[PDB]
Amino acid sequence: MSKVKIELFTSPMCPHCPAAKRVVEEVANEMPDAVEVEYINVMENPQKAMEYGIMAVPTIVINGDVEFIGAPTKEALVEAIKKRL
What we know:
Blueprint: E1 4-10, H1 20-30, E2 35-41, E3 59-62, E4 65-67, H2 75-84
Parallel strand pairs: 1-2
Antiparallel strand pairs: 1-3, 3-4
Helix pairs in contact: 1-2
């Protein structure tokens, strides 16, 4: 009971991925209101996500769970929050 929290903790620099733009559009398809997106381009901000158990960019939160899946952002799970988050 906090709305669907997404966070985007990375500054991808080789592949200019849509990053938070995909993750927001994808979950806003599901929940066009119960959505929170921290797009935190990794620069000038604390490692508060880059701590955790993952300690490996691209550091991504979907619903509230902290993870990283691929060279791009959480696309493997984005294929499933689209399905039944």
